[PDB]
Symmetry: C2
Subunit: 186 residues, 2 copies
Amino acid sequence: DQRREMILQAAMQIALAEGFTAMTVRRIATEAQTSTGQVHHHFSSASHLKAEAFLKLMEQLDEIEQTLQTTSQFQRLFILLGAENIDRLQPYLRLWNEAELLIEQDIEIQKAYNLAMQSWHQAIVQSIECGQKEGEFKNRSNSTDIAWRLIAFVCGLEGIYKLGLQGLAEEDFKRHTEAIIRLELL
Amino acid sequence: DQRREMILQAAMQIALAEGFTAMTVRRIATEAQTSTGQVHHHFSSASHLKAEAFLKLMEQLDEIEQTLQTTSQFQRLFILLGAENIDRLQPYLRLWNEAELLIEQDIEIQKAYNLAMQSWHQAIVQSIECGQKEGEFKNRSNSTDIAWRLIAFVCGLEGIYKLGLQGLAEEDFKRHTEAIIRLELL
């Protein structure tokens, strides 16, 4: 189809710029420049169209991610973890975090989130095994265990920085992350 | 003094067995066998009594963990990081997580939660530096650095578990903690 996917990118723009709470069947029918009723037509609910615009935008994240010229596999892993936080991807990472908080209210979003994370894991699993088969990383451990623990660590470092804890500086994020990568893989 | 403490000890009993929501000054008063007027004389609000009891219970969880005799610091870290699951210690852990979600609605519990996390870190810092001087731990990094990264990792792991991610097993928690401690300190 064409009119459906053209609403899908209308969702995408509003999603990526103004988040989920601005994604109303009305306002995305407005910028798609169709009718509200045509939006009801394709997608079976607004929450279904919110999750569909998320998933397909995370797949936009990771496949603009496969295009960046990296120098080493360590550098490509650092970007994959989200630890580099480049500008071009900043808002895709914004939506990811909004989605993470909406998973208790909206199970379409909660389904989409669990699909994004599963691909994130297999994308890091693919970065580890590639660096290992190329002489860049060592084979200290199972690559699925490393990847689950690198996800654990980068998510856990965020959570602790959320607290305003005393004596824990946010400019040590890149430092602590890089350090856990050398321990696991270098 | 001594009557403020009878009320405190009553708040902690409700807290451990039932949780914060059950800690109304109506309920505390009954169990402390006093008047609701007397509770208000000693604590500003149910939220102040809640946070103050949460702190005492964390001091109490601390004092229980130094009664479990350990052979070394490495197994002492397993106790400190929660990755060991003692039956006695469950409801203190339970209350810790309950408190975690109440830190954006309640300024009192938010203050206590930070203080408890900051003493948690101190303890992990101190157990790293015992092992280091007893010859058991390397000194690859700052004790404070390893200690924060150990905190970020365990919180980050319980977080990922919470999502019901496919192909992630809650069994592996003690495994993944054991690996992180080895990369850092042994």
